[PDB]
Amino acid sequence: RYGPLRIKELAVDEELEKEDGLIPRQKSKLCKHGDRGMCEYCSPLPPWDKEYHEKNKIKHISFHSYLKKLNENANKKENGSSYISPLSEPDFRINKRCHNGHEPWPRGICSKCQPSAITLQQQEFRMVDHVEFQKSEIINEFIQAWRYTGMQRFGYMYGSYSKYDNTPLGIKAVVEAIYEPPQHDEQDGLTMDVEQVKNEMLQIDRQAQEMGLSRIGLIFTDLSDAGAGDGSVFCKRHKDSFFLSSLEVIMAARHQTRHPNVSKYSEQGFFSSKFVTCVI
Amino acid sequence: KTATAILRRGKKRKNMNEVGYDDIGGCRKQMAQIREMVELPLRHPQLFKAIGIKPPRGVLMYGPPGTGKTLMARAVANETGAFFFLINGPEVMSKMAGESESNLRKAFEEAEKNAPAIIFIDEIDSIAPKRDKTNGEVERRVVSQLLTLMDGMKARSNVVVIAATNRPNSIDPALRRFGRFDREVDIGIPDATGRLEVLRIHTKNMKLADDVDLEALAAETHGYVGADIASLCSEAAMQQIREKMDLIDLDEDEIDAEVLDSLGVTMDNFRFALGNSNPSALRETVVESVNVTWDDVGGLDEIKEELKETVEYPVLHPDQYTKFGLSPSKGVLFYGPPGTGKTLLAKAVATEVSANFISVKGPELLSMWYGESESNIRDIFDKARAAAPTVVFLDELDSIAKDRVVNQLLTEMDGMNAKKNVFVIGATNRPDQIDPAILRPGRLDQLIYVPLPDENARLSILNAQLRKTPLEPGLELTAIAKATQGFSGADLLYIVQRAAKYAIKDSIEAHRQHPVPYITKEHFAEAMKTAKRSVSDAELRRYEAYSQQMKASRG
């Protein structure tokens, strides 16, 4: 019986996969049974239990627990299938080669190679659950850049992933240092040549890997000091207005697509890059 | 003549894209209609501008499954070379709630955006069944969306919609109105020539043996649809390989090339495949073509002349009827003892005017009377209109007309177009049992009595039934014809069948003993010894009395 493919994934992913994450519960006062046995209110709570999260004020379910829930729901053992892969990243591009009796899309199309209507809906799980800065100086210097110059900034943050016990099967990205590419920051925004950025970052990443680090996100500042005598900034981003504008959402999506998360439960072998974006 | 004026003249403008007119056979008239409705509006759109009309667009093909509706649609689309959008019923209906409508919207929008286009909605009965079957609200949203898209298209032009379904009634009635699927095409089971053409089309890549008689297979296969013939060929090839399996080593990965080079399908394999095949086209009412002349029927010369005057002149010479302002009769009613050859008369009439033939036996009428059939009287007459000229033969009419079904028949027959050549012929062994309503003018009011065959008629019948069976050279049937006074055609058929049974028994015994390649007169005598008249004298007297009453009442 075919199973997960043979592909190397991060140590954190493996050690998370080893664990079970069940949350034990003690004898409820509504139980009707002796010491041995358990009815419905005493059974261990699955790591993806929505009631537990909403009771503990957690807004997403720690992707590995989402994978656990999918595996539990599907893929019966010893029969009933040949291990349908549970994870499959969405793909909306049209099937340029259908030839179900018709030429390619530009001059013919059938109901089989026609992208179906897309239904947006808030995602219920998050890959990386926490982001931790080893020292305050890492961001203090980043903000000192703006303090001295007055323009905005932008830089990649290097580090590594590890476990996070405060959430069921959660992951935290620990950031050790920040690297700032050559960019032309401006009063209301910033610009940066893409080709120079990637050409430099290739060798920077080689050196960082030799040092043991990895590129795990990007951070930029959006600050406009108020006129008050003290040092204060306007609250431009809040509940009723935008959190991340459309342009930065698009850039984050591109960055995530360019840093795939190698996974063993998807046909392609990757799913939903572990790449975070921070804003000040 | 004019009807197939579009069929006359690299290939395919040079997968499932390779289908072309050369991959179809036995549907010349329907193919002509479909091409005339599709190519002209798109390939030569200036004709209708010159003459000042808007050509109709909606085309609704229907027939038994396997008749080649999808094949015809795809062949026409690939030969026209126009933007072809294919919509599948189940494929659209398998989408989530709210997506099966957006798919249709985008399909029509794209077909309108691009150059002259063809939209083929295969299996439209899935996305727009009859209202009583449209359970749920999504089943109504989809139907309403289809109707709106169909209505909003009439202005665009240079876009033709083709739909296919099994039965005319399976579709929502609202889809068959002006500006919608108004033109209707009916695909019927092919005739002998059509079956031969299909057989040649399919068996063009097989390693046929030299002893293959595709004409014989065409003759034997009656009621076989194109899909049935394809299955026949596939099963014959499977039988051939099964026979050759002895020389093949299944365990070994590779098979010897020499063995693969000796594969050949023999006529015996085709006979075996015929034995295995089970067609289902005739289980439902279908439009079929018949080729009975005034020679498979013996005697009844006066009745033949009466039928000719009744049917042929209206069809062949409508100008004279218009000149005299007299409209032709709609229906006829045969009555007489069973086995007198009424079905043969109906088929001969249909063949004389070269019309299609629809037959509705007694079991079908009873099934409709019990409401456990897919079709219905309205559906039968819709098919008759779509396939006109047509002859609708209602056999065993007395079973139901001893009613809801008779009321439906009266409604449909009254609503029939006077100038449209759709004749109705009813058959009944008990004319008095027939409801008097059906026999009023404008309905099956012309009654004809079909008597038992006479001496010469019996001789002709016996010769016709025995023609395709080997017999002793210098064999006389005059004595058999003379001695069987009062026998109907069925009794003579029984006599000849018993003679053949005796002959085959003797042949098998002789072969087992180890001769009898004929049917000697002793076999005929032995078979005749156990044959008797199937019509009691009382019934013959009753029929004669009814005929005398009719003659007296009309003179």
Place this chain on the structure above:
Amino acid sequence: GKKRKNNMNEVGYDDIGGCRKQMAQIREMVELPLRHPQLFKAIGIKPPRGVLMYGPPGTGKTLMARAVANETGAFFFLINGPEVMSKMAGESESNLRKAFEEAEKNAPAIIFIDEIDSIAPKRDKTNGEVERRVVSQLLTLMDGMKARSNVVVIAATNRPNSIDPALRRFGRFDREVDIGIPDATGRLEVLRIHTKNMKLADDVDLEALAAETHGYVGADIASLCSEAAMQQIREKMDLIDLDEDEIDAEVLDSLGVTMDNFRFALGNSNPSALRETVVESVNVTWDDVGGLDEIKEELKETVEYPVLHPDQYTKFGLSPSKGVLFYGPPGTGKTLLAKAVATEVSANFISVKGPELLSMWYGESESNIRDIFDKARAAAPTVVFLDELDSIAKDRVVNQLLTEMDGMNAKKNVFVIGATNRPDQIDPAILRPGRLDQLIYVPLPDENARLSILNAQLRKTPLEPGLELTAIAKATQGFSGADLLYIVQRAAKYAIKDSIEAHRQHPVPYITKEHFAEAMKTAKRSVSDAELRRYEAYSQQMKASRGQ
């Protein structure tokens, strides 16, 4: 070695017995397209893709599919019906799509859709939005994979009428396979397969168990073996100490299943295969049917010749007869004639008794006439037998029967035999040419026939040495086979009563002549003279109706 080398991937052709015909069909339809695709390339055809197995539950359809898949070495992709239909809204369709796509991606493959009747039930059985979306998805997947892939789809269902009709046409499950109840040899093979790891005792007579189990599907035999083992455990429980958590190996070594346990298990079994119409094998020759020699010759020349010498029929251009109608007093042995006819041409046998037809008339059965004839087609050559046809042929059921008789392919070797006690009461429409046109009268047995019946019925009873039955045969003039069977049964009952009395008093190994005398003292003819005269008059009129 074998199998191209508990863990259902460990089943092969050696774990299936008694279904060699259907196994051969499935193998030629699955292995050949996959193992040797070059044959169909050379012949220039596309092999059929779909296959649809059906039969009573417990007949080993899943076992056959698994065995074929494992032996082929292809990429098996079992799909369950209940498993797929337990998913949330919009997830079952996704599972179907992913299964088909994966099977097509790793060709050659074998998709096995187990219990398809739950995914695509009859159109009137769904009535739900999801139940229609799933069916449409399945149809789309079946159509899409018709070409463009070297994949084979296999499905299993209880009855042909339990599936949406749209799935049984060209480009879809266009091949049908019918699984029937096994015969004596098949049951023996199944018993040998199951009872190979058990600690059978020396006194085991698997042949006897196979003989005593009729209508037992493989599941019933497995349950029988389990029950016998449990009975053995119960019997040995006296030496087992329930309190202790360990049992001496000496006691375990003494376990052994004996014939008594198997007899008990036979007593406590609930087979259900025969509660519905089922195809079955028959082994009656022209020797159990004493007398009726002329009727035997008529049946031979009516049935055997078309089946065994079709070339002669084609040469003479004669179409073989479809069916016949037996009539006569009850108990004359019509079912024996039907079974003998089926046996001679080595055809299957479907029996539809009066209660089943009445249930169909009341519309409270899981099977229809169309279903019966679909099974008959799939299992051809077949003999369908409508017993006591006069209950329904006194109707929509009769109309359906006529429709099916008209529909059936002439060249197909499917023969319909009808039995009735009131030939006049039968609907005339059934007797037209192209239907049950032939009428055969089965009279009461004669003296020699009666003696033959008596001898046949006593081959399983310890009769007294030197016993005679000519006097009994002569004394029973006018008796049918049922009456003679009743006489024998009463004699056996008296003998067993006397044996039990003697044992209780404490001998009586075999029946004696006085037992038969006592049993015959209460003999009574089951056919009144008036009814016999009526049947004779009807036969005489029929002969006159076929006069010169």
